[PDB]
Design an enzyme around this catalytic site. Structure first.
Site, mmCIF file in Angstrom:
data_model
loop_
_atom_site.group_PDB
_atom_site.id
_atom_site.type_symbol
_atom_site.label_atom_id
_atom_site.label_comp_id
_atom_site.label_asym_id
_atom_site.label_seq_id
_atom_site.Cartn_x
_atom_site.Cartn_y
_atom_site.Cartn_z
ATOM 1 N N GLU A 186 0.841 -1.194 0.000
ATOM 2 C CA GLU A 186 0.000 0.000 0.000
ATOM 3 C C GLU A 186 0.876 1.244 0.000
ATOM 4 O OE1 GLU A 186 -2.681 0.136 3.246
ATOM 5 O OE2 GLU A 186 -3.492 2.114 2.743
ATOM 6 N N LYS A 228 -2.622 -1.804 -3.172
ATOM 7 C CA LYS A 228 -3.585 -0.814 -2.693
ATOM 8 C C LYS A 228 -3.057 0.576 -3.014
ATOM 9 C CE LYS A 228 -6.477 0.445 1.243
ATOM 10 N NZ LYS A 228 -6.911 0.108 2.624
#
Lengths: 344, 344, 344, 344
Positions: A186, A228
């Protein structure tokens, strides 16, 4: 592999978990609001911050009806939230597994400043992470979340911040895959600033390229990972208005220039976007005319449940109705990741 | 500095600490033996492992006579050892400061395997390190130790291990300097293997070059650091015999090819060497005909005190005599770092 | 060395050449003005650009008296200039060797833009460079010059430009050392801009660190190299006035933070500075109170001979007098690199 | 793009060229045999090496019938071969354009050793490449070939060789795209050695990851590039026998782990393989059950024309028959890149 890091059985397990997370029509629900963030949200809805408050908030979200069975492929929980129990007394991971999802747990311990940078920070949490991942897999968790924060400024993200965040992401991914847990890389780019969409696309391309270079460097099995990233969205101060089609074009262009096809799916984040804005942007991204060799779904912690949190209002009697609001997003987001969503 | 990481006052403080550590005739004493290592040593001398055992061991070493005032410029302690008190009741850092040294504390939390490498490992400990460094500076500590382990094998150290250890060393150094603590960068090359001296020199050159590249990358103020490298010594299985002059030539050649002159001093480690072997090698290194722009002193945790530990033998009555043995090294090592030591 | 790049004889030869270049009181004369640059200079003095013009210009500079025997340790020539002959008919490298210097030749073929950068450029010339270096060593040349250009701007030097210039410098150095020629690594930072001295020092530190990382990467034998960096001097538009002592402090600080001690000497460049400004700055740099483990001398192509070029004025009858002006710099610069120069 | 390297018109042109090269059923013919290679081939067929020999060889290959119109999407020529004329007198690029293909030209000037490596080499040719690319685009060429050579050994490819070849590939790509020419990045791994298929896959993954990191570093527009990698094939001395299905699985796995989806197509190379072996391997690669987001076609310089060269035998009267043999490959290879080829 000169010295293999995963047996074929482990690679099969990680591939199975990752593909069951991002199966068509499925996305990630993020209940990772830590003490400060959930306290801020409860203050916004006028509720005090206790463990029972988070318990009934998860009862509102996790214990929904059977209509959200295909919509929610997995959820990410907090440590106490993973260990907490429902009103019926069954553990929350058991509730998630019965609903049909897969349990995930936020792993990172927060951001720490980088010395000599314009506010750039890296993320800590690697100490004793293998033991924590082993324990969490013993507790039903099969994937993990680690949030790294890079911001677009006049002179940022610097080379140091980019490579350091990429390296810590790769280390976290290797530690997770060594313990049967599918990491979610992420690298999150803050939407703060006056930068336009072209600048955000350029920075996203560079950050993702360095991220996957670091993943290749640490022998990460890419099919056992998820991504992400932030959608390529201009800053709040950017005067230019970009249509959802332009957002989708820029985002898919960056992902096609950077992300290898071995990645099972890309689960976008809210990034301060509204629920309807995130739904429309995800629908446009799934409707892009380009060739998209990975699943493009959602990982939302605010978009899916802002309406439900407002409807609850610190009151139990609104529970079902508030749950309804949550469903009103999940089903819609199941249409957003399939490119089948129609606003209004 | 585009965005300065240290004010001039902080740079002055770090420079003062670093130069007082490696002042001519001064070296580092390493009492960093963790529970496992001190338990192994106490088993070797036939003593059980308790906190009182470590307490009187430090009473043996730390509370020596006044002859070791110039020899010991600083000591590195363990967390409990830093917090422990003497028989008189005065805290150990107060004892060290009264003796004339500077207190240091081992910071690293140990080595963790790197996935996909031939036994290569990285070192953890960065989580919440800024708060720990602030607390330790509140407790009189002014420098820190972080040991990274790289080994010479047929295909090792890999690029991944080298860059990862260099990056974590640079991160630890930045966190330490942000809290008034002088870091000791310790990329330690294991002497295990059949590799000859040329191979060790080559690997040391590459490792040190990557280490200082990473230090430059993280905006480390080099004058507020110290270096703890292994001497360029062949493996145990290497059949070729290298004189102390050759050891000194190879070591100083590697340090001159790699280490910038801004480094106040280079404090070598024992690395499994004997006390007399380490003393003679340090004396030869300080007698090298080359131009050596940094202090070349010792940081020994075994050489200075192996004789004292054997003399103690788990018995209090030998205390003074055992302390004498410790002095018999310290003075000698003060002659080793000045190039004034004569064996026998 | 796992696979050695130089035999000990070759390392000895490179060390001998490099140390004879930067011997105390000796510096580099740069006659590397290409067709465009020498044409601009001759237009400034009102002379047309022909081969005979360059021939008598070198006769003015190269065939000086015996007072410049210790001052000029080496000269860098152009290809035609290396192949040209004097009025007496003896080849110019023979003249230089009889004078006591060592012949050098500019190798780089010029700068080419980098796509996607704010005017940043890299340097070409690597094609068939080994054969050219072999030929030039057959022609008496023992060292070479390769000029890379990095500029300080709002967003420059970018990471791409820094690493690309460092990599091409390291490639040129490896090719030169493979053919008995001592390379001069010349990462030259343009003084153009409004940046102050602190910014120039920071950029110089980063550039030199990346340069020596690239040199370590390509297995460069550092003792067979020289360095030609710009002094840390603020931009022309910088309103702040920095004394020569501050220039010396910043320059020596950058060199001590970056340059390894294995470098035999650092030969500064003019960088648009005046002759007296360069002489005073070099004298201050040689008088810095810090520990300077490498020779700090000059490599000037404008400072040493601007007065001589103006005195010549495209006229033969001024020859001796013009030569006198050249000597008036060389002797002075021999005092600048020894820290023995007194202005006025 | 902070400072754009290509206007949208240039990106459109490069995308059009790249997609017309690798259109379904189309592949690259490689006539890039330099003087030494074509002399070796002509010695194998018993013909002397003259310009007329290459002229009628290209007349044999380039001036084929109309059946090879869809099969050959483009050809790569040599400098003289690009400038040579046919028997009719029309220039060869005009012949290729009339046939329906696109003209390409080999750009690299050959391999040069890297000092300090086990026989590893880098490729030169960057000097004045922008002017050459401008001239070649004026001569009808729209893409270029640059061959970099990396070999799998016990300790190779080293980090230095990998990053240096990747960097020179990225530089060549940037120079080509700045002049309207679509580069073909060709990191070619030699099949020499005893390494098995797993080792080749691992090395291919690392090399391709570093290659695309370098391409991202130099701001390469990926949609205006092509890739020419070796298939993941074990060494000649490897005793294990791998089926074509295993070759396809390993190759597509490496390409999915490394190559971004923005790459229009991947044109494999012969790599010493036989014509039928290359055809079957390409057919299996195009029949892989995995998701392949880029075109997987051929760039063969030996497989397509070995039979034609043997049939010609230095004799004109076999011309048509020899041309037939060439067609017997091209059509077949058009079935190989469509996954529609049936052996025997």
């Amino acid at each position: 592999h000169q010295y293999p890091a995963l047996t074929p059985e482990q690679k099969k397990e990680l591939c199975d978990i990752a593909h069951r997370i991002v199966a068509p029509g499925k996305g990630i629900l993020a209940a990772d609001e830590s003490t400060g963030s959930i306290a801020k949200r409860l203050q916004s809805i006028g509720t005090e911050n206790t463990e029972e408050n988070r318990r009934f908030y998860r009862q509102l979200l996790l214990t929904a009806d059977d209509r959200v069975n295909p919509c929610i492929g997995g959820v990410i929980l907090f440590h106490e939230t993973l260990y907490q129990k429902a009103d019926d007394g069954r553990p929350f991971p058991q509730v998630i597994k019965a609903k049909g999802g897969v349990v995930g747990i936020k792993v990172d311990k927060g951001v720490v400043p980088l010395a000599g940078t314009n506010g750039e920070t890296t993320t800590q949490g690697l100490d004793g992470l293998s033991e924590r991942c082993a324990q969490y897999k013993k507790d039903g968790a099969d994937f993990a979340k680690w949030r790294c924060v890079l911001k677009i400024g006049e002179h940022t993200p610097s080379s140091l911040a980019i490579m350091e965040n990429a390296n810590v992401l790769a280390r976290y991914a290797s530690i997770c895959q060594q313990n049967g847990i599918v990491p979610i890389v992420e690298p999150e780019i803050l939407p703060d600033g006056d930068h336009d969409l072209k600048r955000c696309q350029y920075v996203t391309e560079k950050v993702l390229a360095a991220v996957y270079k670091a993943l290749s460097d640490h022998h990460i099995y890419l099919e056992g990972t998820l991504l992400k990233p932030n959608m390529v969205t201009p800053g709040h101060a950017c005067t230019q208005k970009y249509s959802h089609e332009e957002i989708a074009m820029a985002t898919v262009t960056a992902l096609r220039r950077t992300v290898p096809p071995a990645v099972p799916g890309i689960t976008f984040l809210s990034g301060g976007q509204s629920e309807e804005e995130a739904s429309i942007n995800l629908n446009a991204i799934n409707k892009c005319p380009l060739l998209k060799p990975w699943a493009l779904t959602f990982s939302y912690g605010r978009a899916l449940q802002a309406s439900a949190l407002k409807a609850w209002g610190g009151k139990k009697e609104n529970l079902k109705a508030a749950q309804e609001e949550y469903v009103k997003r999940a089903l819609a987001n199941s249409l957003a990741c399939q490119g089948k969503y129609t606003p209004s």
